[PDB]
Amino acid sequence: LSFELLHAPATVCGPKKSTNLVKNKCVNFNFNGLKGTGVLTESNKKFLPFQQFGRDIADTTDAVRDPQTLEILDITPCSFGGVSVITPGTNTSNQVAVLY
């Protein structure tokens, strides 16, 4: 049973239930075998009718094409960043300040 990697729109797999998708929310996605975490937003870019999901310099699925609705989406990661704690001193006080 020979197989080939995801270089084309997928045809044959199991009968997994396809639920409705949501937009502008922190939701996991599973688009034709690839999974990731992020939000789904409408994009103003262009995808030639033959074009599959795009890629970037860092080789990540920045944009995907819906096989059902034939719609335009982007993948962007969640709101993350470093946290800074301001400690005036252990002997001075226990109050701290949280900086994002």
Partner: peptide, 29 residues
């Protein structure tokens, strides 16, 4: 800034892709 400095800052020159992949640039103090 002085007009000489106004010429100086104008002679010295995506960040979102680097910001997404764990690379952050702290602003100068």
């Amino acid at each position: 800034r002085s007009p000489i400095e106004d010429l100086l800052f104008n002679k010295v020159t995506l960040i979102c892709a680097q910001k997404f992949k764990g690379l952050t640039v702290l602003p100068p103090l």
